[PDB]
Amino acid sequence: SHMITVATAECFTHANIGLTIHKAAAGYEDFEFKYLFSEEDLKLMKNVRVISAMFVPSIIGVEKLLDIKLPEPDFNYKYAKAYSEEKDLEVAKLMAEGLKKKLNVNISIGSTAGVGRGAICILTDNNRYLFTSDVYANLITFENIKERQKNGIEKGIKRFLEILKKEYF
Amino acid sequence: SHMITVATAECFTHANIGLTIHKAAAGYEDFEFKYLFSEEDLKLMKNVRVISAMFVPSIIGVEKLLDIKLPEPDFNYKYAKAYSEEKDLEVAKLMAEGLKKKLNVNISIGSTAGVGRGAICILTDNNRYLFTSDVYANLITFENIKERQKNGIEKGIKRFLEILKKEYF
């Protein structure tokens, strides 16, 4: 017997998907994305616990923490280390999978966004859900970065809850 | 040759010390704790890079991510767990040393608060700094949690800038 455990390794989303899931689970009355959760969602959230929520903007950093090897970035300059959308998808997956092996949680989440719509991977005991944000942006030129970040957090949380209710309840 | 690298493993401060250092280093024009940074600090900040800021509210979680062993909690109700001051201070220091060993960063930060004033350790290449927050709170009764969290963030960042200046500049 245990709780439904979750951990996250996030880049463009700033650990906000895992921080939000934690505040919801911990019964906070106020938090930025609380409007995403119904009354019933918040009840179910009482059964959830965040084990870690990590902001990981370093390739070497996350490789050392999660024992994983990431692909070479498509843009490799230092006001511009960035993956294309295809490798962002691959990276969100390798991080989710590495976290799940590191921490043995029920649900792990990876997020990364370079050039394109970015990538979130939610991996559970049952299935893997991989998706982009709805917002094209460009880390190297700074176009639409803010809007992509916000949409990534909202979509990641929205999908997390659908998945949680589907598989665990 | 290298930048000044920083990593953090934060519990009560919610990874906000690391996220705030990152936003400053990244030249964000505003962000919640910007008022702690002088215009000269902000210039110095461009030579700093955050490798990871992690929120780690699980003992097993931080033990697995940092490869350390933590002391038994002083209050352990399975779902609720807290240290008092002496073990909080030990644990901040264990996390900071663990982070420095794992990631080889110049500056590592650990934070944890159970019952009492909580504990922040800032570990550099040259020195170790260990201090409590200024606010007594109690995880178990919930008294003064919010006030201690904000004070821990402000005091960590303030002491961080002082140390960065004194040692790296």
Ligand SMILES: Cc1c(O)nc(CC(=O)O)c(C)c1OP(=O)(O)OC[C@H]1O[C@@H](n2cnc3c(=O)[nH]c(N)nc32)[C@H](O)[C@@H]1O
């Ligand atoms: C704020 C805080 C703390 O003081 N100590 C620790 C342990 C450590 O640092 O060693 C953690 C993890 C922490 O962060 P957390 O968000 O877990 O707050 C701890 C608990 O404190 C309660 N709590 C915190 N903020 C709120 C809030 O806004 N509303 C409610 N209802 N409970 C809250 C919740 O039960 C929550 O589980």
Ligand SMILES: Cc1c(O)nc(CC(=O)S)c(C)c1OP(=O)(O)OC[C@H]1O[C@@H](n2cnc3c(=O)[nH]c(N)nc32)[C@H](O)[C@@H]1O
């Ligand atoms: C937003 C974002 C993103 O789209 N992609 C990545 C790589 C990962 O996915 S991790 C990351 C790490 C990411 O987070 P950040 O490093 O906080 O933001 C990327 C860059 O966008 C810039 N930026 C974001 N907000 C501001 C801002 O408010 N002011 C300025 N001057 N720059 C900003 C800043 O230069 C920052 O380095």
